[PDB]
Amino acid sequence: AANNPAIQNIRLRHENKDLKARLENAMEVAGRDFKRAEELEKAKQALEDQRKDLETKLKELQQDYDLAKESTSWDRQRLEKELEEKKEALELAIDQASRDYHRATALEKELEEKKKALELAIDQASQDYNRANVLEKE
Amino acid sequence: ANNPAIQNIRLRHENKDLKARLENAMEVAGRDFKRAEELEKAKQALEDQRKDLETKLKELQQDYDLAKESTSWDRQRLEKELEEKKEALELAIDQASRDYHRATALEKELEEKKKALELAIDQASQDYNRANVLEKE
DSSP states (O other), X not given: OOSOHHHHHHHHHHHHHXXXXXXXXXXXXXXXXXXXXXHHHHHHHHHHHHHHHHHHHHHHHHHHHHHHHHHHHHHHHHHHHHHHHHHHHHHXXXXXXXXXXXXXXXXXXXXXXXXXXXXXXXXXXXXXXXHHHHHHHO | OOOHHHHHXXXXXXXXXXXXXXXXXXXXXXXXXXXXXXXXXXXXXXXXXXXXXHHHHHHHHHHHHHHHHHHHHHHHHHHHHHHHHHHHHHHHHHHHXXXXXXXXXXXHXXXXXXXXXXXXXXXXXXXXXXXXXXXXX
């Protein structure tokens, strides 16, 4: 404004002090939050970096389970296979005994048949042994 | 040299000068604040995880740790069949050898009752004829 000079001079001089001072310290605060920022960037890294670590160890593991998985399957698999062979290898064994059994039984028959002939054969014989004496007498 | 209009403009400049230089640093604080504050966000997020993933590992360790035992048993159990089988095979092979040679036991005791027959033949017929001449007497 176009008023008198020496008075305005008062206020400007004051403002210049405050402005300089108001500055002065805004630099001081944008001082801290800088270092503080730079502080965190480290702290961030630190962790961000120490999560990469823990992805590994996690992945690592997961697979090792995942792995157990397959291995368990295959053995369970393989056993079911043995379990197979043996069921089978059982039926046969079964069809054997039975067979051998039935043969033995039937052999027992021919045998018992042979037994009976043997009796009447062994009988006849003696029924003649005495025919001899009979004749040897007179 | 110290004359109102002069200073009272000299100041007017030094003033704009500063008022600007203020408006600036007003902003640089601005950014410098933003930057950082929006990193404790990052810090915090990263961690709403370091704690979170920390667990997945633990829990996986848990689960795995179990699979572990259970699997061992199956490998164990499978080895068991292979045992039984392998063992029970010896018996088969035993019984076989035991029954087998035992067959030759009878093949022997056969040619034996065989050649034994031969003779009774020979004999009988021999003392058929021998008995027969006497039939002329």
